[PDB]
């Protein structure tokens, strides 16, 4: 009548998990593998970062008023916002998306001065009420609006060339003005047919201002479309123009690498994180997450499930 018995533990409330053979095994304990809660803020601790607020990354290169505080600097993450303004004077940039990406992966920009001069017969200081400053009418800080100094005069066939004397590639932006009327065109530039030709050792293209009636925005019915390339070290880029060019007073140099975040989430300098998205920041040790398909940084892989429990205990057999 003497004996020893062997047994295993159990618990009153088991957790349910999936296995290869059984969709509902009760085990003693389990733990979540999919992260479903994130932080509703941008965790910027440990980062030299830049919140552009209503300044748009492109606006940094051309120099929109909104971006006055963001024309230069250095950083390791950049934060774009839904608001953001690039174009005070209405327009568009050819290959926009390639460009903001380039910028958003940069971690810093310097502005180098073109040294362009124009002088007599030509007014290099056109402004507009769409780009107001302190206050008053003004313009894109890194460009000059060139217009016939007088009248409704033919604009001089002009030549400016930027020489890259640096060791690194520079990024050159310029604008082409497209007026709303034949009259307007004639007032600013000649009656002459207009042509802007741009040429480096690697780049070559040409543009023609083009008149058309258009909805008023903001503002004006004119448009300034922007264009860009990279000028290699020790190369030169030459503008041949007879009016219509919005020329560069400065070119940009993109410096390092950096992480680009697009979110309206508030900054929080008191949490670290490596993974971000539109709704904010993600900090988790788990390999999987459920918050978003679109993340940036070092992130748990996205999955299409609320929960995936991993058993951390034996089969739970109560009584």
């Amino acid at each position: 009548g003497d004996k020893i018995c062997l047994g295993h533990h159990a618990v009153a409330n088991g957790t349910i998990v999936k296995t290869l053979t059984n969709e509902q095994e009760e085990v003693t304990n389990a733990t979540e593998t999919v992260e479903s809660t994130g932080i509703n803020r941008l965790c910027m601790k440990g980062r030299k970062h830049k919140d552009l607020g209503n300044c748009h990354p492109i606006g940094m290169l051309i120099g929109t008023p909104a971006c006055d505080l963001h024309l230069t600097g250095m950083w390791d993450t950049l934060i774009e916002r839904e608001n953001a303004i690039a174009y005070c004077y209405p327009g568009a940039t050819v290959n926009v998306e390639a460009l903001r990406q380039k910028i958003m992966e940069s971690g810093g920009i310097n502005k180098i001065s073109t040294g362009f001069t124009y002088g007599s017969s030509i007014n290099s200081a056109g402004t507009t009420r769409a780009c107001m400053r302190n206050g008053g009418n003004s313009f894109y800080a890194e460009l000059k609006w060139l217009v016939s100094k007088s009248k409704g005069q033919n604009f001089p066939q002009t030549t400016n060339t930027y020489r890259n004397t640096d060791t690194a590639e520079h990024l050159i932006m310029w604008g082409i003005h497209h007026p709303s009327s034949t009259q307007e065109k004639n007032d600013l530039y000649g009656t002459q047919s207009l042509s802007i030709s741009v040429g480096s050792s690697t780049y070559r293209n040409n543009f023609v201002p083009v008149v058309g009636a258009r909805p008023q925005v903001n503002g004006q019915s004119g448009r300034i479309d922007f264009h860009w390339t990279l000028v290699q070290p020790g190369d030169n880029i030459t503008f041949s123009h007879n009016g219509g060019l919005i020329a560069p007073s400065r070119v940009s140099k993109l410096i390092g690498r950096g992480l680009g975040i697009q979110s309206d989430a508030p900054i929080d300098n008191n949490c670290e994180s490596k993974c971000f998205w539109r709704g904010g920041s993600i900090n988790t040790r788990l390999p999987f997450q459920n918050l978003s398909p679109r993340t940036v940084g070092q992130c748990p892989k996205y999955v299409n499930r609320r929960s995936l429990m991993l058993a951390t205990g034996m089969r739970n057999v109560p009584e």
Binding site: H9, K18, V27, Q262, A311, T312
Partner: protein, 172 residues
């Protein structure tokens, strides 16, 4: 289950055992006791811990965006990006689902094995001085004092010391 013990020839777990995963219940002259086997317990937890360490902790490559959240993106390229992210998500979710299913099967079964391993240890140590109940109990055909019980659970029990005595009750 796979190793027949937990949810097998043992018909239930012991909610009272809170000092470990595996353990012994004894009945003898001085009455009843219960105690957990720390060694087998730790064999099982250490392996669970290994699983968690693998699960957590993965170096991730860095990803930058390819879809603008605030701009519009070109329609064809957007669709190709969408196709690719969707395709990749299907793969990860499938993966995650298989991972958890196969780990969970293995985790449950290794827990079963460690329980068996301990049972088998005790059976072997008793040799002929006890026989198998069929439900996790070993019926001891000799006076096994609380100290003697402890010698089993301490794996220091000498079967030779009680052998010929025990081989008696055998036949009556």
């Amino acid at each position: 289950g796979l190793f027949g013990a937990i949810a097998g020839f043992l018909e239930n777990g012991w909610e009272g055992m809170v000092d470990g995963w595996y353990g012994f219940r004894h009945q003898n002259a001085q009455g009843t006791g219960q105690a957990a086997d720390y060694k087998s317990t730790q064999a099982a937890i250490d392996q669970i811990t290994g699983k968690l360490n693998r699960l957590v902790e993965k170096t991730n490559t860095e990803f930058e965006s390819i879809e603008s959240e605030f701009s519009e993106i070109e329609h064809q390229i957007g669709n190709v990006i969408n196709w690719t992210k969707d395709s990749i998500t299907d793969i990860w979710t499938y993966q995650a689902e298989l991972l958890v299913a196969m780990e969970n099967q293995h985790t449950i079964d290794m827990a079963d094995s460690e329980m068996l391993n301990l049972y088998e240890r005790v059976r072997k140590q008793l040799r002929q001085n006890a026989e198998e109940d069929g439900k996790g109990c070993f019926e001891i055909y000799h006076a096994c004092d609380d100290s003697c019980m402890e010698s089993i659970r301490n794996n220091t029990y000498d079967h030779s010391q009680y052998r010929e005595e025990a081989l008696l009750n055998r036949l009556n």
